């Protein structure tokens, strides 16, 4: 079923975008998490980063890199599930028989 | 690391036969070709 | 012309020649004679080089 | 003011000015153009020379003075010591 | 509340940076489209230097001729050099000034718009 | 207080300029899409080649530079404040360039196969270029350049780097 893979990949990309937004918002401490957009974002992103908070402590106890590590791990995981041939120029198999492909 | 992830990915009607003409029709439409 | 395309770009032999010897193909499940010369049938597959060039031209046109 | 001397730029400018002053002191000719350079290179009085020729005569006199100074003052002192085994590039 | 450095060393605001950014982008956009800036365009100068020099020379020569003397022409870049080799070297300054006519006046970017 | 707050000298300015040259190396690939228009900036295509060679001699050089600057320079409170501020500003500009690269990597194919991408590429250079130039204009001068959404975070991070494990 192509629809299943399509929907799964779309959901994974949306979750990756949410994690990237959380990483970006970690730079600003003035934002209030009680406001509707930030509250919804943190409600969505709480458990996945909460797992890594327990798994990985801060390096020196003063700086936090947990959202970045979660984003990188999820990026690698979703990269694992990319389509075999993404078309663009990939499905043309480059030019002729090639060392690369 | 690169090799481990590559091996896992390789571990997992063909593409060029049907998908090449399917994706082009679905995404890049033109009446001179698809009408 | 050929002199222009050779000038543009030929190939990058990082792993050596990218074109290899040809492999004849024979029909498995069923000719005007002319049995003097056996014609090459290596290109009858879809995964070959000629089909790749044709798909490249079709993609460029589309 | 020592405050001016404290800055690196002022020191560099003063060093450049001193080098220029020493060079002008040791290479600028006086009366040797007509005496030696002009007659030797053109065989004419400097006044009759074209403006671009007088500069050439002055440059020739200055170069002769520079070579004389570098031979009679620096090279004699540094060559009184003979060739001290003359280290050479090994590779 | 945060330190923000000593007050003796001058600080630049954010408004100046925003103005610089917007000004650069607007300059590029105005240069790209000559005819869209309220029906007008953006000009670097008012009068070309050659035009001003020609007008001034014309007026000066008229005044000198009317006064009863042979008019003189003032050259942009400088006068001649007393040399006896070649003609280009003798008039090098004026030729150097005149050889930059196209770059001095015309703009480097394309005058019209392509792809739109 | 014991923190040094004197003016920055020339070697720190040179170091900060060399540090600022990093995002230019990161985004130098898309200079042609901008240079095709307004050729007067064509020199910007040929200026970063030695820096491209030196910063890319090893795959993990940027992380080593970041760790050597954040801990070795920004943490120290005996270095003048302006030098640390400029080092952190350069690091943050590099981070912004990395963010731009990451958001480039996920462009849809529809935008990829349209001229819009070219425009995007041009902007990816131009904006970054402006920032660097601006910072450089306030790097050779021992002044503070303030940029929205960045400078306040840099000011906080400077004092968070201090009293680290103390
Ligand atoms: C065409 C040439 C090149 C330009 C130049 O010469 C003419 O201009 C000259 C003149 O401008 C000099 C400057 C004069 C002003 C000086 C200012 C001084 O600042 C020092 O510290 C304080 C300011 O921070 C006070 O000023 C103090 O009083 C001074 O000690 C600075 O340290 C050196 C200084 C800038 C000097 C540097 C060297 C110069 C620029 C000289 C420079 C070579
Ligand atoms: C030659 C140059 C100059 C010298 C220098 O660079 C090289 O040497 C470097 C090196 O010496 C660094 C020090 C190494 C030792 C570090 C010690 C560290 O103490 C920390 O104390 C915290 C206590 O909570 C940590 O615990 C945290 O929380 C969890 C508990 C840990 O787990 C987690 O990890 C962390 C953990 O117990 C320990 O990490 C301190 O916070 C920073 C520290 C002192 C570093 C400060 C900066 C340095 C001195 C650098 C210093 C600039
Ligand atoms: C008879 C004398 C004539 C000499 C004329 C000298 C012209 C030099 C004037 C100074 C110009 C400054 C550029 C020097 C930067 C060195 C970088 C370098 O070499 O890159 C050399 C590169 C060229 O790079 C070369 O390009 C080649 C192209 O085929 C190849 O790729 C080579 O591999 C590559 O090395 O050029 C540049 O990147 C030029 C950058 C210019 C940046 C603008 C400067 C902005 C500030 C200007 C302010 C004025 C500066 C003072 C000017 C007055 C000076 C008296
Ligand atoms: C324009 C784009 C928008 C501006 C974006 C500016 C870059 C944002 C940086 C994204 C966060 C980077 C990161 O992982 O920070 C993760 C954390 C963010 O650290 C936070 O920084 C804030 C800045 O004021 C405050 O200091 C917070 O206390 C601190 O938690 O960074 C580190 O732990 C140290 C900095 C490493 C760089
Ligand atoms: C030219 C390179 C010499 C630079 C260091 C000499 C100057 C010197 O050592 O002065 C010491 C230098 C600055 O010290 P102060 O500010 O006290 O010195 C001001 C006066 O000493 C000026 O002479 O401190 C450093 O270690 C900064 C240099 C970091 C390293 C700079 C690297 C430059 C980039 C790499 C090239
Ligand atoms: C229906 C509603 C659709 C309307 C969408 C409106 C969007 C307008 C955005 C601007 C379009 C301008 C139109 C415009 O400027 O060019 C847009 C154009 C991109 O091509 P497009 O696909 O937009 O247009 C090609 C057309 O054939 C199809 O639209 O740029 C290029 O060709 C390369 C330009 C590089 C230029 C580099 C320098 C750029 C300097 C200016 C930076 C401007 C941004 C400043 C930000 C402060
Ligand atoms: C990429 C755009 C980010 C915008 C969200 C951050 C805005 C912070 C405003 C803080 C006001 C106190
Ligand atoms: C400002 C640097 C140069 C100043 C000194 C000039 C040296 C030549 C003087 C000749 C006098 C006869
Ligand atoms: C920095 C923003 C880049 C563009 C993000 C939006 C992409 C445009 C298409 C969205 C709807 C398909
Ligand atoms: C409708 C297609 C997308 C329009 C906007 C694409 C270009 C955005 C440039 C932003 C650069 C940071």
Curated annotation (Swiss-Prot), chain C:
It is found in: Plastid, Chloroplast membrane. Belongs to the ycf78 family. Essential for cell growth. May be involved in binding chloroplast DNA to either the chloroplast envelope or the thylakoid membrane. This is Uncharacterized membrane protein ycf78. It comes from Chlamydomonas reinhardtii. The chain holds residues 731 to 828 of 1995 of the full protein.
């Amino acid at each position: 079923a192509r629809t299943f893979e399509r929907a799964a990949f779309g959901f994974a990309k949306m979750y990756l975008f949410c994690l990237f937004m959380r990483v970006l918002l970690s730079w600003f401490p003035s934002i209030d998490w009680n406001s509707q957009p930030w509250a919804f974002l943190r409600l969505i992103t709480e458990p996945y980063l909460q797992i890594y908070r327990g798994i990985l402590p801060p390096l020196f106890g003063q700086l936090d890199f947990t959202p970045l590590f979660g984003f990188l791990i999820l990026q690698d995981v979703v990269e694992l599930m990319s389509p075999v041939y993404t078309l663009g120029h990939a499905k043309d198999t480059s030019m002729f028989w090639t060392t690369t492909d | 690391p690169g090799p481990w992830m590559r091996s896992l990915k390789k571990q997992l009607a063909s593409g060029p036969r049907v998908e090449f003409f399917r994706i082009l029709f679905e995404q890049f439409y033109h009446p001179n070709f698809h009408d | 012309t050929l002199r222009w395309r050779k000038t543009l770009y030929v190939a990058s032999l990082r792993r050596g020649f990218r074109k290899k010897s040809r492999k004849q193909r024979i029909l498995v499940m069923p000719d005007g004679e002319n049995s003097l010369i056996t014609k090459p049938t290596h290109s009858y597959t879809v995964l070959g080089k000629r089909a790749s060039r044709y798909r490249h031209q079709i993609y460029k046109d589309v | 003011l020592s405050g001016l001397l404290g800055d690196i730029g002022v020191k560099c400018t003063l060093a450049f000015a001193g080098t220029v002053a020493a060079g002008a002191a040791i290479v600028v000719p006086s009366g040797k153009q007509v005496e030696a350079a002009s007659l030797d290179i053109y065989g004419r009085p400097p006044s009759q020379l074209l403006p671009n020729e007088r500069r050439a005569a002055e440059f020739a006199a200055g170069h002769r003075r520079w070579k004389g100074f570098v031979d009679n003052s620096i090279y004699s002192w540094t060559r009184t010591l003979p060739g001290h085994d003359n280290p050479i590039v090994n590779p | 509340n945060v330190y923000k450095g000593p007050a003796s060393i001058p600080h630049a605001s954010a408004e100046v940076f925003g103005a610089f950014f917007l000004a650069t982008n607007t300059a590029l956009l105005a240069h790209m489209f000559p005819g869209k800036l309220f029906g007008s365009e953006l000009h670097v100068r008012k009068w070309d230097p050659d035009y001003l020099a020609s007008c001034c020379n014309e007026q000066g020569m008229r005044r000198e001729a009317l006064s009863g003397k042979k008019p003189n022409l003032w050259l942009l870049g400088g006068g001649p050099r007393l040399v006896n080799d070649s003609w280009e070297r003798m008039w090098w300054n004026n030729l150097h000034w005149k050889r930059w006519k196209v770059p001095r006046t015309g703009p480097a970017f394309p005058q019209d718009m392509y792809w739109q | 207080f014991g923190r040094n707050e004197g003016p920055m000298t020339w070697p720190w300015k040179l170091m900060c300029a060399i540090l600022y040259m990093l995002p230019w190396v990161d985004v130098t690939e898309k200079t042609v899409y901008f240079v095709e228009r307004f050729p007067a900036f064509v020199w910007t295509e040929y200026f970063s080649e030695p820096f491209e060679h030196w910063y890319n001699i090893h795959e993990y050089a940027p992380l080593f530079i970041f760790f050597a600057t954040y801990l070795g320079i920004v943490r120290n409170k005996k270095i003048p404040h302006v030098a640390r501020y400029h080092v952190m500003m350069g690091v943050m500009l590099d981070i912004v360039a990395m963010i731009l690269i990451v958001t480039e990597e996920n462009l849809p194919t529809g935008v990829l196969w349209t001229p819009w991408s070219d425009l995007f590429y041009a902007l990816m250079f131009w904006f970054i270029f402006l920032l660097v130039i601006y910072c450089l204009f306030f790097c050779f001068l021992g002044w503070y350049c303030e940029i929205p959404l960045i400078s306040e975070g840099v000011y906080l991070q400077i004092e968070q780097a201090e009293q680290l494990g103390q």
